[PDB]
Design a protein around this nucleic acid. Structure first.
Ligand SMILES: [Mg+2]
Ligand SMILES: [Mg+2]
Ligand SMILES: [Mg+2]
Ligand SMILES: [Mg+2]
Ligand SMILES: [Mg+2]
Ligand SMILES: [Mg+2]
Ligand SMILES: [Mg+2]
Ligand SMILES: [Mg+2]
Ligand SMILES: [Mg+2]
Ligand SMILES: [Mg+2]
Ligand SMILES: [Mg+2]
Ligand SMILES: [Mg+2]
Ligand SMILES: [Mg+2]
Ligand SMILES: [Mg+2]
Ligand SMILES: [Mg+2]
Ligand SMILES: [Mg+2]
Ligand SMILES: [Mg+2]
Ligand SMILES: [Mg+2]
Lengths: 225, 124, 109, 63, 51, 216, 19, 128
RNA sequence: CCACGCGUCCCCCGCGAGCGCACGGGGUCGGCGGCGAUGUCGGCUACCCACCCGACCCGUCUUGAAACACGGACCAAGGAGU
RNA sequence: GAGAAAGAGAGUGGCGCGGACGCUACGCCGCGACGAGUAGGAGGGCCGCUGCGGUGAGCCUUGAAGCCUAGGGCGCGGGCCC
């Protein structure tokens, strides 16, 4: 008779439409909560440095837990220890990049490599530029560009991040499931630096480019993507 | 059956012809004239074919009947259609559709019938 | 009833020391000698006007011996106001140091 | 460039039976469809065993 | 599907993040309001210098 | 059926409404506007009466046919693009026509037509240039203006009036419109000194002159 | 609300309330 | 006005020059059919700068515009008049060529049969 | 302000309709202008010539060949894992 | 195709005759990442030579094989068709 089946499938279509609408209001107010959280995280440390200076003391800030690592020297002639640590940091091509959270194992891993990388403490704007500009997802071990939120949600919904905003939130405020979030993101592929490197084969301290720029990776991401 | 015959006649037939990185079959009941499983016309229980008439007006449409499969003399039936161009296509369309007679290629039959009709109208 | 093109000299191709990429002319437009000053000419279409033996057509006229190869000034080059160009067919190298007209009409004033 | 080593870049396993038998290729034409279009892995392993060589599918005896 | 850059292209930024719309509404309203405030304080300062 | 209002969002920048979704809910007032809930003609024939069919079947089929396109969105046809000027071309501005058979001549811009093209008359009493369309880009626009706001160009002249037909003879309404527009342009430029000699004299480049250095 | 099998009655209630 | 094909794309070719075999210009015994050289000093095989180029796979044409004549069609070599009912249905893509061995009094019949079938023929006035 | 109504028990203080614009799952024009029958239009390639940049002669033994290492005047046919 | 293990499941009570292409399944189609190479190993050749079994109601004195070619072309190339 079909006058029941069409009504039922229209109810089903409308139901999943209302479901999608509720998910959109969800990730909207999650992004709002995150903006409130980043105002709080940015003003809290300024307020505490101010109270330390007005007491006359000092305030050593939180030693940073998130770095962005860019491969600076090329394939040819790598010492094999350094080649293996680069294969674990997923810097294979020249001028790739990867987020890395910091602990005692990871700092020694970066410092074995350190003539071949430039790694720094990225801003929230740097994490935004990298995720929206070049951020691709390793789905089914293929490299599908993160065009819409369903590509993030199907692969990391089990760790309760749905959209690109709580992806960026986990990576910036390094969360519990940072391992699988960062392993989800493909190794970033950046262009050659506009303007140019000052000197590749030396450390940043001695007027070069390799090594540990601390905050000054936020002047090099801006011109490498 | 039919796929058994197709896995034999598929490469080693005599109607097949291979050159210029193309392939064909010159078999007598092949709409679109190409070597494929669907459009081949000797290996099926039911099969349309579109031939131009012996005289220079009209289309003989060939049906393969259902009963005498192994009897090739009483296996095909010719129907001569000598009409206006629209109703020739209408007859072939109704003939394939409303019989439910191998509807995979009603469109190929009316393409081939249209090509034969434009070849059969006179030339400027 | 006078000139409506700026004078420019085809100095060379866009080239390495041991490699030349023939898909890009280097034009030296006379008068302009800095990157501060070259940004009037970006996008201005340019032309290599030359004569040849047997006659060819001329649009809006009758056939005669002159011929052109059109182009376009793409972007600046160096710090002496040297500029690049891409022509719709690559220039013959008998044109090295001969007057390419650079027109005014793709104007943005 | 990329420093991936291309030794084991290509899988070695079969995608079609080496036999030019036509009944075996009809059974493959059926089980390709069944393993592609069902969700039971009996069909995948039975087409994988239709592909094999006759020294990899040895004669099972009635005992 | 080709990747259009969400920083340049606006409605893909909204497709990925619909709160980016209210952030880019409030920041344009904030910049316009602070702009007229600084113009008004400069006008009041030139009125005080004329006084 | 109600008469449609205009948009209650003022455009802040392109694509962003100045009012949010809830404030626009309040302004549109949806809190009190909620809701809940051919092919055959019969013609008589003097027999019987025949059901004639419009939009019949096709007589022919081409032997193979192209498929449909994927359909995209922002690709509007030319008659409905948005049309932009430069900032330096306002009505009243003297232009330098750079490319036509009227190349190099100083003229008087009148109006942006509906199909993008500038309307030009350096009045043909002065430099022999009629009411002519001329493209925005192919023109150097100098900085010399006249007080053209108080003139009345004829309404009945557009791109469909200047569009080419198919020798070419000058029709009478062309010269009537020409006389009727330059007869109120040209006395307004005789009030400016040495301007009629300017519109006669043509732009050209001499030795030692360079367009990047010369301001106009 | 926004996760499916436990938000069915809430999305149903907002559907009955949207009218 | 001849028989236009169905769709006429822009046939972009990556290299129009042929590949002559290394030192075919030099001797006369070495005809210009390309043979990849296997020398251990051979400055073509090891790709020096400014030598003869080598025919790699990247010079392969687009699969949509491969084997395509500049008139938009594809050739099909035809020996007798019975082998144009082959091209009767692929009328808008594939054109016929009449073979070199076919006599004059048969090439005439092939040409008028193709003019009836509206199949475009590359060499219709070959011998006369 | 991605806040909307009514009904009731307790706690603390599941289908509304229509139209339309579109920074929206990869370019369209529902925009145009010229020249063409005995001198012009197109043909990348292939014939000759000019110019810029590149550019050492092959085979082979070699740690290394353009080598002041050996074989090779030029051409046709024969000629080596059966 | 869609963030959420699983049914556009079936039962019992309270006018106009119309709908492109496809699928040589060894076929067609979609995603990504990738491409150096002597010795050597392997795969594919609608690359080529000569002969034999089939087959093309093949071609051929209305001019086959061969050879020549500033002619038209195809293929990355072996080569091939005019
Ligand atoms: Mg090195
Ligand atoms: Mg630069
Ligand atoms: Mg001259
Ligand atoms: Mg590569
Ligand atoms: Mg390798
Ligand atoms: Mg291997
Ligand atoms: Mg060597
Ligand atoms: Mg050597
Ligand atoms: Mg040199
Ligand atoms: Mg030796
Ligand atoms: Mg030895
Ligand atoms: Mg030695
Ligand atoms: Mg060796
Ligand atoms: Mg020596
Ligand atoms: Mg020796
Ligand atoms: Mg010797
Ligand atoms: Mg020999
Ligand atoms: Mg290789």
């Amino acid at each position: 008779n079909f006058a029941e089946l069409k009504i039922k499938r229209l109810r089903k279509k409308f139901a999943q439409k209302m479901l999608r609408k509720a998910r959109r209001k969800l990730i909207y107010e999650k992004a709002k909560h995150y903006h409130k959280e980043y105002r709080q995280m940015y003003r809290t440390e300024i307020r505490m440095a101010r109270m330390a200076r007005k007491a006359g003391n000092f305030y050593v800030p939180a030693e940073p837990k998130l770095a962005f690592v860019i491969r600076i020297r090329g394939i040819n002639g790598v010492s094999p220890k350094v080649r293996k640590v680069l294969q674990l940091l997923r810097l294979r091509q020249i001028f790739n990049g990867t987020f890395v959270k910091l602990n005692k194992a990871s700092i020694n891993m970066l410092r074995i490599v350190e003539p071949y990388i430039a790694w720094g403490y990225p801003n929230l704007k740097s994490v935004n530029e990298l995720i929206y500009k070049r951020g691709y997802g390793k789905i089914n071990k293929k490299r599908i560009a993160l065009t819409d939120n369903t590509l993030i949600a199907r692969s990391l919904g089990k760790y309760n991040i749905i959209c690109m905003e709580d992806l960026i939130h986990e990576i910036y405020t390094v969360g519990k499931h940072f391992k699988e979030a960062n392993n989800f993101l493909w190794p970033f592929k950046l262009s050659s630096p506009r303007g140019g490197m000052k000197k590749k084969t030396t450390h940043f301290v001695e007027g070069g480019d390799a090594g540990n720029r601390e905050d000054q990776i936020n002047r090099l991401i801006r011109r490498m993507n | 059956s039919a796929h058994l015959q197709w896995m034999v006649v598929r490469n080693c037939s005599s109607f097949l012809i291979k050159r210029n990185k193309q392939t064909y079959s010159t078999e007598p009941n092949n709409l679109k004239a190409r070597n494929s499983f669907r459009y081949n016309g000797l290996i099926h229980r039911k099969t349309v074919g579109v031939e131009p008439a012996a005289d220079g007006k009209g289309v003989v449409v060939v049906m393969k009947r259902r009963s005498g499969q192994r009897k090739p003399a009483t296996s095909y039936v010719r129907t001569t259609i000598n009409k206006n161009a629209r109703a020739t296509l209408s007859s072939i369309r109704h003939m394939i559709r409303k019989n439910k007679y191998h509807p995979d290629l009603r469109m190929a039959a009316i393409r081939r019938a249209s090509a034969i009709l434009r070849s059969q109208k006179p030339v400027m | 009833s006078g000139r409506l093109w700026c004078k420019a000299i085809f100095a060379g191709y866009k080239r390495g020391l041991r490699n030349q990429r023939e898909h890009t002319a280097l034009l030296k437009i006379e008068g302009v000698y800095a990157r501060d000053e070259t940004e009037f000419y970006l996008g201005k279409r340019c032309a290599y006007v030359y004569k040849a033996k047997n006659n060819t057509v001329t649009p809006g006229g009758k056939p005669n011996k002159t011929r052109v190869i059109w182009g376009k000034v793409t972007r600046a080059h160096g710090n002496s106001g040297m500029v690049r160009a891409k022509f719709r067919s690559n220039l013959p190298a008998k044109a090295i140091g001969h007057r390419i007209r650079v027109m005014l009409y793709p104007s943005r004033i | 460039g990329v420093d991936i080593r291309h030794n084991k870049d290509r899988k070695v396993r079969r995608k079609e039976p080496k036999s030019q038998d036509i009944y075996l290729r009809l059974l493959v034409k059926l089980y390709r469809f069944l393993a592609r279009r069902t969700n039971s892995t009996f069909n995948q392993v039975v087409l994988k065993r239709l592909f094999m060589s006759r020294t990899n599918r040895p004669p099972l005896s009635l005992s | 599907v080709l990747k259009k850059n969400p920083l340049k292209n606006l409605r893909i930024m909204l497709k990925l993040n619909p709160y980016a719309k209210t952030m880019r509404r409030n920041t344009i309203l904030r910049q316009a309001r602070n702009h007229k405030l600084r113009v008004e304080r400069a006008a009041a300062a030139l009125a005080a210098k004329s006084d | 059926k109600g008469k449609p209002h205009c948009s209650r969002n003022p455009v802040l920048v392109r694509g962003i409404g100045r009012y949010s979704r809830s404030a626009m809910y309040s302004r549109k007032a949806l809190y009190k506007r909620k809701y809940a809930a051919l092919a055959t003609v019969t013609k008589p024939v003097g027999g019987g009466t025949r059901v004639v069919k419009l939009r019949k079947m096709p007589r022919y089929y081409p032997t193979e046919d192209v498929p449909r396109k994927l359909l995209s969105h922002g690709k509007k046809p030319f008659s409905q693009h948005v049309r932009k000027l430069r900032a330096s071309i306002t009505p009243g501005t003297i232009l330098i026509i750079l490319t036509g058979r009227h190349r190099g001549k100083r003229v008087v811009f009148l109006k942006q037509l509906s199909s993008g093209l500038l309307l030009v008359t350096g009045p043909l009493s002065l430099n022999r240039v009629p009411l002519r369309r001329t493209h925005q880009k192919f023109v150097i626009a100098t900085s010399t203006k006249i007080d053209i706001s108080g003139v009345k160009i004829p309404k009945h002249l557009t791109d469909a009036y200047f569009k080419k037909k198919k020798k070419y003879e000058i029709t009478e309404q062309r010269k009537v419109d020409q006389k009727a527009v330059d007869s109120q342009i040209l006395p307004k430029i005789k009030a400016v000194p040495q301007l009629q000699g300017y519109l006669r004299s043509v732009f050209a480049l001499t030795n030692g002159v360079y367009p990047h250095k010369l301001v106009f | 609300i926004a996760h499916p099998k436990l938000g069915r009655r809430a999305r149903a209630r907002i559907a009955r309330g949207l009218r | 006005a001849a028989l236009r094909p169905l769709v006429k794309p822009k046939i972009v070719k990556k290299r129009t020059k042929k590949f002559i075999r290394h030192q075919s210009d030099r001797y006369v015994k070495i005809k210009r059919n390309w043979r990849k050289p296997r020398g251990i000093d051979n400055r073509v095989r090891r790709r020096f700068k400014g030598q003869i180029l080598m025919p790699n796979i990247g010079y392969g044409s687009n699969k949509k515009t491969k084997h395509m004549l500049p008139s938009g069609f594809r050739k099909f070599l035809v020996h007798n008049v019975k082998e144009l009912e082959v091209l009767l249905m692929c009328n808008k893509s594939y054109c016929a060529e009449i073979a070199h061995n076919v006599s004059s009094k048969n090439r005439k019949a092939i040409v008028e049969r193709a003019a009836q079938l509206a199949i475009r023929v590359t060499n219709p006035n070959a011998r006369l």
